[PDB]
Design a protein around this ligand. Sequence first.
Ligand SMILES: [Mg+2]
Ligand SMILES: [Mg+2]
Ligand SMILES: [Mg+2]
Ligand SMILES: [Mg+2]
Ligand SMILES: [Mg+2]
Ligand SMILES: [Mg+2]
Ligand SMILES: [Mg+2]
Ligand SMILES: [Mg+2]
Ligand SMILES: [Mg+2]
Ligand SMILES: [Mg+2]
Ligand SMILES: [Mg+2]
Ligand SMILES: [Mg+2]
Ligand SMILES: [Mg+2]
Ligand SMILES: [Mg+2]
Ligand SMILES: [Mg+2]
Ligand SMILES: [Mg+2]
Ligand SMILES: [Mg+2]
Ligand SMILES: [Mg+2]
Ligand SMILES: [Mg+2]
Ligand SMILES: [Mg+2]
Ligand SMILES: [Mg+2]
Ligand SMILES: [Mg+2]
Ligand SMILES: [Mg+2]
Ligand SMILES: [Mg+2]
Ligand SMILES: [Mg+2]
Ligand SMILES: [Mg+2]
Ligand SMILES: [Mg+2]
Ligand SMILES: [Mg+2]
Ligand SMILES: [Mg+2]
Ligand SMILES: [Mg+2]
Ligand SMILES: [Mg+2]
Ligand SMILES: [Mg+2]
Ligand SMILES: [Mg+2]
Ligand SMILES: [Mg+2]
Ligand SMILES: [Mg+2]
Ligand SMILES: [Mg+2]
Ligand SMILES: [Mg+2]
Ligand SMILES: [Mg+2]
Ligand SMILES: [Mg+2]
Ligand SMILES: [Mg+2]
Ligand SMILES: [Mg+2]
Ligand SMILES: [Mg+2]
Ligand SMILES: [Mg+2]
Ligand SMILES: [Mg+2]
Ligand SMILES: [Mg+2]
Ligand SMILES: [Mg+2]
Ligand SMILES: [Mg+2]
Ligand SMILES: [Mg+2]
Ligand SMILES: [Mg+2]
Ligand SMILES: [Mg+2]
Ligand SMILES: [Mg+2]
Ligand SMILES: [Mg+2]
Ligand SMILES: [Mg+2]
Ligand SMILES: [Mg+2]
Ligand SMILES: [Mg+2]
Ligand SMILES: [Mg+2]
Ligand SMILES: [Mg+2]
Ligand SMILES: [Mg+2]
Ligand SMILES: [Zn+2]
Ligand SMILES: [Zn+2]
Length: 309
Amino acid sequence: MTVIHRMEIPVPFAVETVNVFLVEGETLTLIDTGTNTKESRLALEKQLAALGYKVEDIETVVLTHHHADHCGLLDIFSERTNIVGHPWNEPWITQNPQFIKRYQQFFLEASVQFGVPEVLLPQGALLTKTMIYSCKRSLTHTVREGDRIASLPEFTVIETPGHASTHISLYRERDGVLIGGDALIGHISSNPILEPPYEGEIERAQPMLQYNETLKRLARMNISRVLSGHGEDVLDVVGLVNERLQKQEARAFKVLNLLKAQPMTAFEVCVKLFPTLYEKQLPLTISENVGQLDFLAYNQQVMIDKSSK
Ligand SMILES: [Mg+2]
Ligand SMILES: [Mg+2]
Ligand SMILES: [Mg+2]
Ligand SMILES: [Mg+2]
Ligand SMILES: [Mg+2]
Ligand SMILES: [Mg+2]
Ligand SMILES: [Mg+2]
Ligand SMILES: [Mg+2]
Ligand SMILES: [Mg+2]
Ligand SMILES: [Mg+2]
Ligand SMILES: [Mg+2]
Ligand SMILES: [Mg+2]
Ligand SMILES: [Mg+2]
Ligand SMILES: [Mg+2]
Ligand SMILES: [Mg+2]
Ligand SMILES: [Mg+2]
Ligand SMILES: [Mg+2]
Ligand SMILES: [Mg+2]
Ligand SMILES: [Mg+2]
Ligand SMILES: [Mg+2]
Ligand SMILES: [Mg+2]
Ligand SMILES: [Mg+2]
Ligand SMILES: [Mg+2]
Ligand SMILES: [Mg+2]
Ligand SMILES: [Mg+2]
Ligand SMILES: [Mg+2]
Ligand SMILES: [Mg+2]
Ligand SMILES: [Mg+2]
Ligand SMILES: [Mg+2]
Ligand SMILES: [Mg+2]
Ligand SMILES: [Mg+2]
Ligand SMILES: [Mg+2]
Ligand SMILES: [Mg+2]
Ligand SMILES: [Mg+2]
Ligand SMILES: [Mg+2]
Ligand SMILES: [Mg+2]
Ligand SMILES: [Mg+2]
Ligand SMILES: [Mg+2]
Ligand SMILES: [Mg+2]
Ligand SMILES: [Mg+2]
Ligand SMILES: [Mg+2]
Ligand SMILES: [Mg+2]
Ligand SMILES: [Mg+2]
Ligand SMILES: [Mg+2]
Ligand SMILES: [Mg+2]
Ligand SMILES: [Mg+2]
Ligand SMILES: [Mg+2]
Ligand SMILES: [Mg+2]
Ligand SMILES: [Mg+2]
Ligand SMILES: [Mg+2]
Ligand SMILES: [Mg+2]
Ligand SMILES: [Mg+2]
Ligand SMILES: [Mg+2]
Ligand SMILES: [Mg+2]
Ligand SMILES: [Mg+2]
Ligand SMILES: [Mg+2]
Ligand SMILES: [Mg+2]
Ligand SMILES: [Mg+2]
Ligand SMILES: [Zn+2]
Ligand SMILES: [Zn+2]
């Protein structure tokens, strides 16, 4: 029945490549796409051609999540193509004007709240500004926990939030294969990527706790092999999860101990945690602080505008 192929698509991010998966079944399904770049598109087209296919032959595209490396080429697919993912992808992937306005307001406010020096901010650009690597295309179909995608009958949709709010993985009960997305990556942690609140969202799960719960769920599943969004397959999910949970705990303690010595802004903690990477890249830190603020381990001296932890 199905033949699954991994295609490695170049992306202009530190991870260098994204894994996309072509499933040759009764119809042709692609899982994830690559960024909205000429380079990504050319690579996808070339690798499809070597398999004897053109973009127009793909009848279903499934998104594991809304990050640009996974959805960015959505516009290229034929008008007949089913586009399937978590429902919350929709505002991101359509670049809904109201969503974009909210996104821009959130990040401006966040920059101030976290005390990011203006010189480091995307500002103009960065060899790259923002949102520019994403698509402008709607879903045709939404999926949630336990759902089946018509073109992938042996798989079940599992909600795997944490890395992103829109994150899903595809589980094949027959042989325990998971098309994981970015929920569990072998070589690097895939910790929560900060997002704006959705319109109407009063609250979301504590993101780090959600990520950890997703990890624990995966560890309890009977998974033989994770086909990951980046890097090599994961064959020992239990082992990897245990390691990641241990590392997360250590980092949380490191943050807690940093703050005991000197109360700090998020940016200041970031510079302590990532003394080399903070100029080249910008993550996390807030995830750890927010995790500790939940769990009532750390207080925020709100007042100034630049929050003090
Ligand atoms: Mg059959
Ligand atoms: Mg192949
Ligand atoms: Mg291949
Ligand atoms: Mg390959
Ligand atoms: Mg390849
Ligand atoms: Mg054929
Ligand atoms: Mg055929
Ligand atoms: Mg045939
Ligand atoms: Mg090839
Ligand atoms: Mg190939
Ligand atoms: Mg090639
Ligand atoms: Mg083509
Ligand atoms: Mg082609
Ligand atoms: Mg074509
Ligand atoms: Mg395009
Ligand atoms: Mg469909
Ligand atoms: Mg999705
Ligand atoms: Mg919507
Ligand atoms: Mg929308
Ligand atoms: Mg978009
Ligand atoms: Mg708005
Ligand atoms: Mg702060
Ligand atoms: Mg600061
Ligand atoms: Mg921006
Ligand atoms: Mg982008
Ligand atoms: Mg465009
Ligand atoms: Mg348009
Ligand atoms: Mg559309
Ligand atoms: Mg639907
Ligand atoms: Mg269903
Ligand atoms: Mg399915
Ligand atoms: Mg379907
Ligand atoms: Mg179908
Ligand atoms: Mg995210
Ligand atoms: Mg989430
Ligand atoms: Mg299944
Ligand atoms: Mg099963
Ligand atoms: Mg996860
Ligand atoms: Mg990971
Ligand atoms: Mg991996
Ligand atoms: Mg991890
Ligand atoms: Mg982040
Ligand atoms: Mg975001
Ligand atoms: Mg995001
Ligand atoms: Mg929304
Ligand atoms: Mg929280
Ligand atoms: Mg759990
Ligand atoms: Mg498992
Ligand atoms: Mg389960
Ligand atoms: Mg790897
Ligand atoms: Mg491998
Ligand atoms: Mg492994
Ligand atoms: Mg301690
Ligand atoms: Mg500092
Ligand atoms: Mg560093
Ligand atoms: Mg975060
Ligand atoms: Mg609480
Ligand atoms: Mg607040
Ligand atoms: Zn991602
Ligand atoms: Zn990714």
